Amino acid sequence: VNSFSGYLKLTDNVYIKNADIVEEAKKVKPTVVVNAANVYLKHGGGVAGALNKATNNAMQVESDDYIATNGPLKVGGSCVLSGHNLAKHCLHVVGPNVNKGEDIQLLKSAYENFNQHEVLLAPLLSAGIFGADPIHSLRVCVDTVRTNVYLAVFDKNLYDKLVSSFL
Numbered sequence: 294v295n296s297f298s299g300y301l302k303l304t305d306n307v308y309i310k311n312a313d314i315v316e317e318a319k320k321v322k323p324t325v326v327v328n329a330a331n332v333y334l335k336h337g338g339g340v341a342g343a344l345n346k347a348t349n350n351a352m353q354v355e356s357d358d359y360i361a362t363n364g365p366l367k368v369g370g371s372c373v374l375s376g377h378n379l380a381k382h383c384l385h386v387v388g389p390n391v392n393k394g395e396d397i398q399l400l401k402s403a404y405e406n407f408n409q410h411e412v413l414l415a416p417l418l419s420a421g422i423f424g425a426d427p428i429h430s431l432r433v434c435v436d437t438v439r440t441n442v443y444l445a446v447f448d449k450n451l452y453d454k455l456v457s458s459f460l
């Protein structure tokens with residue numbers, strides 16, 4: 294039993310809700326919140342910009358030190374950093390950005406990072422400003438993640454389409 298509330302159950306391990314991931318994290322304080330990161334950990338917009346803003350830019354300061362030490366992530370890769378005031382940890386995961394010409398096949402690799410964590414709050418990888426089809430991202434999530442994932446979908450209209458079209 295966990296403290297996630299109001300989710301629709303899609304499969305044995307995947308749950309979905311129309312919600313702002315920032316407000317969800319602040320309420321639940323999950324062990325792991327997933328960020329929709331880029332390889333530079335430059336948290337400018339979308340989920341990343343919103344999460345970072347909610348940390349008063351502390352996420353960006355920590356991220357800049359991480360990059361200065363380690364260099365950029367790989368597309369499809371991840372790193373674990375602090376969750377600041379939002380969660381214990383933030384798993385920064387880089388899905389392919391179609392608006393940069395990146396290979397959508399890397400979306401499965403991106404979701405594989407979730408399997409290293411028993412329970413996560415997360416957005417749909419590569420959706421929104423990353424330019425992929427959210428229906429496809431949900432399918433890849435369900436077919437790749439085996440741990441317990443609670444998906445927050447910001448746009449109510451998109452949420453209804455994801456639910457109604459889910460196979």
Ligand SMILES: CC(C)(O)[C@@H]1CCCN1c1ncnc2[nH]ccc12
Nearest residue numbers: 313314340343416420421445446447
């Ligand atoms: C599918 C996406 C890209 O993840 C959705 C579609 C709109 C934005 N986005 C978000 N989802 C959850 N929490 C969020 N907080 C700020 C933005 C945001």
